[PDB]
Write a sequence for this structure.
């Protein structure tokens, strides 16, 4: 499916991502918007020959298993297709896991470039969260 800002924002907060490891909700609603265009079924290949899945574009190099990346580590132990359903439970569980590791939300290259250090509250302005 494709979410509207507030509709997403609400689900994300509901799952417990608002101030997860210090990142305001905005940072995540911001990420989702650039990563996938709020689009649950967004799939994009990378230079590596890995693939980015789901509303947050978790890649099949490390986190999920798309049964075609060789050298796949599958850290979330989830078939990548599980990322692509209307319910974001899997995406969010596998996001809490990624950010908790090393480089924080620097992992998402369209958060580094597009969101980081911008009036990020914007993305939740005019939603009753």
């Amino acid at each position: 499916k494709v979410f509207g800002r507030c509709e997403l924002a609400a689900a994300m907060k509901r799952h417990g991502l608002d101030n997860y490891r210090g990142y305001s909700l905005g940072n995540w609603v911001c990420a989702a918007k650039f990563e996938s265009n709020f689009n649950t079924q967004a799939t994009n290949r990378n230079t590596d020959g890995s693939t980015d899945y789901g509303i947050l574009q978790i890649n099949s190099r490390w986190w999920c298993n798309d049964g075609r990346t060789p050298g796949s580590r599958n850290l979330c132990n989830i078939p990548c297709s599980a990322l692509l359903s209307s319910d974001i439970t899997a995406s969010v569980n596998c996001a809490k896991k990624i950010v908790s590791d090393g480089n924080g939300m620097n992992a998402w290259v369209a958060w580094r470039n597009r969101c980081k250090g911008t009036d990020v509250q914007a993305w939740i302005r005019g939603c009753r969260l």
